[PDB]
């Protein structure tokens, strides 16, 4: 109760302004709904410490570890190898370096299926891709074949940094899908 | 019909509380409507309030039974049960327990349609933060504009407590903050969703330069509280009635107040572009009733928001869609 | 002890503090300096600690549409309707639903995958990860993130987290593969 009388607050002084608020419980994300300037497509957020807490631990008991996996590939981490560190410590840590990313796919992923998509994403740009966004906004996570990638939908990604990711907005299926070493993707040919 | 020794209220013999608690299922069946709905915040421990000072003004002897408005009590149970003794003796009263805030009892209560809804906090408070002494009101307030309801939440009229001035703001969205102006300039205010108990303590400066004024808000505000009534409750048996005297129902004729709507009826020709003073000489002389102000528009073409004017003067143009506060004998 | 072995029973605990991780597990690398995503019981997952969460904050400022993409995959489809549905306290509504509503029984989930047997057998025996990758992929429309390997390779039933190896990564007939699936 006390921490939306604040969004109340902060939302009359300046309508547009960009709100994210850390609730307790999941009940309480109604009240928010109900607030006039409070619009989540326009991009306004809520994140529920019961929600994510409890749902962390469920996705454990289905798969075992998972909640490792998703809490280090959703927040920054350090990867510093060094020679003392035991084998397994290095190959974790090399994991724990991964990030999630956005960026809008290359006019070369043209009505592509999804599958066909992962696999160019992962064999020729080093990427795994996980979902797009699709038109009307919705997110989808691993689409099946019955779906085509339209041109310029946004993708998820997992990579090293940002950088490492661009390739998938520049390459080129006539320019560059001849090219082995992928630190040279982004050019003017396509 | 029966009434309290005095005749001043309505009145019936006792019952439990269990004779007019109702369930969500007994509450929507009934097909209630021009009601008044009353959301009560309070924790069983919290003070008393006394929801007499609410039900018994709106139960006074001078309307007639089938006007008498309905009235649906929505709170904690166990509350309502250290109340209830005050309360035993009124007609056309219930209650239904739990939260005001699950949509499923409002909903319950046909909301939509009530002539009035009422927001009340009795939980302890200002030993708090003084900005969030009122969570409930505010949040309960947005809770029910942002309803809808098929075959509207915007259009539900409503009044609240607030218990501390400076959150008159957050009532309310559209609107030229300035959070400079004062409660009696801000639009919640001039429209009267709001109400703070702070204009109590200038009721006591007003008493004092101007002594007898106190009695006339008295008279005007409770339907007549006598002092033969406040000695009549003194003697702590509760208000006793029957079927009172002739010479006692005698006094159901005093003046009330009501608003006119200028819309139809005898006006009409007034709210067709009359001026006030017009319509005052000609509405006294004819019906002997006394014109106090306008309650119109701000919107003026509507959006269900109005404001008061007091006293206007003797050429002020009126509009058909205008609201007249009178004081009557009807 | 069972009789007809504790050690081998599963769990997932909440550390309220960090530091207390130390404790959940003895044997160790002890090394109280190592911040909590280094230490065994993080790693292996026998931990969990809510100050996650406050991490998710400052991400999903830097990234907007990132936390939908947790709570899709977190909460197996929270939308907003529910959401709606759950403000009008009434509690879960139900019945027997129609095909049209009943066409949401196939999203995705996620799942793990042993490489000891079934299909995959064979990239278990001594293969590498983009074998493994392009190939599920292909033939089941799956889409592999990780591996879950044990530390004691040879075992002690504690493994530890690889979130997407490279392509050349070798695999082990033991090792457990993180996917996303529609099965």
């Known amino acids: ?190 | 019909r029966k009434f309290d020794s005095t005749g001043m209220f309505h009145w019936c013999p006792d019952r439990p509380l269990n004779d007019c608690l109702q369930d969500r299922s007994q509450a929507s069946a009934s097909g209630l409507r021009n009601h008044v709905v009353v959301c009560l915040f309070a924790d069983a421990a919290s003070p008393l309030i006394g929801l007499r000072n609410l039900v018994m003004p709106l139960r006074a002897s001078n309307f007639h039974y089938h006007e008498l408005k309905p009235t649906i009590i929505v709170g904690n149970l166990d509350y309502l049960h250290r109340e209830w003794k005050t309360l035993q003796n009124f007609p056309k009263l219930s209650i239904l327990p739990g939260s005001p805030l699950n949509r499923a009892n409002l909903r319950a209560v046909n909301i939509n349609l009530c002539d009035m809804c009422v927001i009340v906090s009795a939980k302890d408070r200002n030993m708090e933060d003084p900005n969030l002494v009122d969570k409930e009101a505010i949040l309960c307030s947005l809770n029910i504009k942002a309803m809808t309801f098929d075959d509207a939440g915007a259009n539900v009229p409503l009044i609240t407590e607030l218990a501390n001035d400076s959150n008159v703001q957050f009532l309310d969205q559209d609107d030229d903050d300035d959070p400079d102006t004062e409660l009696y300039m801000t639009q919640p205010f001039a429209c009267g969703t709001a109400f703070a108990v702070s204009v109590l303590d200038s009721l006591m400066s007003t008493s004092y330069f101007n002594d007898n004024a106190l009695t006339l808000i008295r008279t005007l505000i409770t339907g007549g509280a006598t002092p033969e009534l406040e000695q009549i409750l003194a003697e702590g048996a509760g208000m006793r009635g029957g079927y009172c005297s002739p010479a006692v129902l005698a006094n159901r004729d005093r003046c009330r107040v009501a608003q006119i709507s200028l819309f139809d009826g005898p006006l009409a020709q007034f709210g067709q572009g009359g001026h006030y003073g017009e319509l005052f000489v000609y509405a006294l002389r004819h019906f002997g009733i006394l014109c106090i102000g306008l309650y119109r528009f701000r919107d003026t073409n509507p959006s269900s928001k109005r404001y008061v004017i007091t006293n206007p003067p003797e050429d002020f143009p009126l509009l058909p869609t205008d609201q007249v506060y009178v004081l009557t004998y009807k």
């Open chain 1, 1 to 190: 109760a006390a921490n939306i009388m604040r969004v109340i607050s902060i939302k009359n002084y300046h309508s547009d302004i960009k709100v994210i608020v850390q609730l307790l419980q999941y009940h309480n994300k109604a009240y928010l709904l109900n607030i006039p300037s409070w619009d989540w497509k326009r991009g306004d957020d809520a994140v529920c410490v019961a929600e994510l807490k409890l749902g962390f631990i469920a996705q454990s008991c289905l798969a075992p570890g998972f909640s490792t996996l998703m809490a280090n590939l959703f927040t920054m981490r350090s990867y510093k190898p060094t020679p003392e560190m035991s084998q397994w410590q290095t190959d974790y840590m090399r994991g724990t370096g991964m990030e999630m990313y956005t960026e809008y796919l290359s006019s070369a992923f043209n009505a592509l299926t999804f599958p066909e998509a992962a696999e160019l994403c992962f064999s020729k740009l080093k990427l795994l891709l996980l979902a797009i966004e699709v038109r009307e906004s919705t997110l989808a996570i691993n689409p099946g074949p019955k779906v085509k990638i339209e041109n310029a939908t946004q993708g998820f990604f997992i990579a090293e940094s940002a950088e490492e990711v661009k390739r998938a907005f520049y390459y080129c299926k006539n320019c560059h899908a001849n090219v082995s070493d992928v630190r040279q993707i982004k050019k003017c040919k396509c």
